[PDB]
Write a protein that holds these residues in place. Structure first.
Motif, PDB file in Angstrom:
ATOM      1  N   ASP A   1       0.582  -1.019  -0.200  1.00 51.66           N
ATOM      2  CA  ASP A   1      -0.026   0.012  -0.017  1.00 51.66           C
ATOM      3  C   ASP A   1       0.574   1.505  -0.008  1.00 51.66           C
ATOM      4  O   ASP A   1       1.585   1.550   1.000  1.00 51.66           O
ATOM      5  N   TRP A   2       0.651   1.850  -1.174  1.00 52.11           N
ATOM      6  CA  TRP A   2       1.484   3.321  -1.242  1.00 52.11           C
ATOM      7  C   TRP A   2       0.869   4.486  -0.419  1.00 52.11           C
ATOM      8  O   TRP A   2       1.798   5.287  -0.113  1.00 52.11           O
ATOM      9  N   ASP A   3      -0.300   4.437  -0.301  1.00 51.58           N
ATOM     10  CA  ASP A   3      -0.643   5.608   0.702  1.00 51.58           C
ATOM     11  C   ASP A   3      -0.022   5.234   1.870  1.00 51.58           C
ATOM     12  O   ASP A   3       0.313   6.418   2.886  1.00 51.58           O
TER      13      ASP A   3
ATOM     14  N   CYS B   1       2.681   3.650   2.520  1.00 51.75           N
ATOM     15  CA  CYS B   1       4.128   4.170   2.284  1.00 51.75           C
ATOM     16  C   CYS B   1       4.545   5.703   2.373  1.00 51.75           C
ATOM     17  O   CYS B   1       5.400   6.105   2.849  1.00 51.75           O
ATOM     18  N   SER B   2       3.477   6.405   1.777  1.00 52.25           N
ATOM     19  CA  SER B   2       3.455   7.854   1.898  1.00 52.25           C
ATOM     20  C   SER B   2       3.396   8.484   3.181  1.00 52.25           C
ATOM     21  O   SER B   2       4.345   9.543   3.617  1.00 52.25           O
ATOM     22  N   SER B   3       2.503   7.980   4.086  1.00 51.07           N
ATOM     23  CA  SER B   3       2.283   8.389   5.165  1.00 51.07           C
ATOM     24  C   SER B   3       3.658   7.983   6.293  1.00 51.07           C
ATOM     25  O   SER B   3       3.945   8.782   6.954  1.00 51.07           O
TER      26      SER B   3
ATOM     27  N   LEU C   1       6.606   7.698   5.166  1.00 55.93           N
ATOM     28  CA  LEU C   1       7.836   8.591   4.618  1.00 55.93           C
ATOM     29  C   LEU C   1       7.534   9.920   4.855  1.00 55.93           C
ATOM     30  O   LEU C   1       8.580  10.565   4.760  1.00 55.93           O
ATOM     31  N   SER C   2       6.407  10.395   5.183  1.00 53.71           N
ATOM     32  CA  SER C   2       5.997  11.700   5.455  1.00 53.71           C
ATOM     33  C   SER C   2       6.481  12.124   6.750  1.00 53.71           C
ATOM     34  O   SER C   2       6.482  13.398   7.341  1.00 53.71           O
TER      35      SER C   2
END
Lengths: 130, 50, 56
Positions: free
Chosen positions: A112-114, A116-118, A120-121
């Motif tokens: 899940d890239w969402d 992953c973005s959360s 990495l943010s």
């Protein structure tokens, strides 16, 4: 003539297949390997001594590489066994689900890239370096 | 390293060296066969009469 | 027993020839050595059995 036991003229023996008297390198055409990694060129002069490590095959990259990734530096891991593990429709059809049999690890819920973005943010500034 | 081999005959290489191990072991196998023939002869005599 | 003594001489000469042939087979192809070892095995048991016949 006098006959002697188990000395039979009609019994004949042949050479081994392949014959180890010959150069089996030349028999199966391994001359390219032999002359490509021969320690000396075949005219009497010494060839160039190849290096112990893989600097020559990692020198063609533009990166941060100044040392050698080995077993003992603590940066690599033993992935050999995980590296070694193993698992109408026509031939073509059978081959696209052979190509698609592994893609299931590429989409969510596996990657899940969402999320992953959360994660990495949450990264802040700078890195502690010695 | 896989680019180094052009004819992709590395299995030919491996089979050649396993064949080499078999052939280097055949002579010692013949020697041990002669030794087993020697050991077969221990019971097979007839000693001096008493 | 003179027939047995000459047969013993013939068996000795055949054993020596079979050893020479075994060395030749080992020098060209050590994969048909099994029959030559078998021939040496039967020549030797024939020699030993002839000695046992001569033993009485």
């Amino acid at each position: 003539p006098s006959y002697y036991y188990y000395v039979d003229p009609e019994t004949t023996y042949t050479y081994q297949q392949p014959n180890p008297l010959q150069d089996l390198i030349s028999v199966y055409g391994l001359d390219d390997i032999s002359r490509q990694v021969a320690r000396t060129n075949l005219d009497g002069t010494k060839a160039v001594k190849l290096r112990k490590s893989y600097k020559n095959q990692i020198a063609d990259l533009s990166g941060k590489f100044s040392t050698i990734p080995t077993r003992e530096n603590g940066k690599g891991g033993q992935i050999a066994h995980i590296l070694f593990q193993n698992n109408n429709m026509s031939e073509q059809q059978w081959r696209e689900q052979l190509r698609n049999r592994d893609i299931a690890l590429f989409q969510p819920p596996n990657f899940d890239w969402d999320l992953c973005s959360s994660v990495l943010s949450q990264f802040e500034r700078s890195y502690p370096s010695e | 390293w896989t680019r180094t081999i052009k004819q992709n005959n590395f299995h030919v290489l491996i089979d050649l060296l396993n064949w080499f191990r078999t052939t280097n072991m055949n002579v010692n196998n013949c020697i041990w066969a002669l030794k087993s023939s020697l050991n077969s002869m221990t019971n097979a005599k007839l000693p001096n009469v008493d | 027993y003179q027939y047995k003594i000459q047969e013993l001489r013939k068996l000795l000469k055949s054993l020596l020839l079979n050893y020479l042939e075994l060395i030749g087979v080992l020098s060209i192809n050590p994969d048909m050595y099994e029959r030559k070892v078998e021939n040496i095995r039967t020549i030797l048991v024939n020699i030993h059995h002839l000695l046992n016949e001569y033993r009485p």
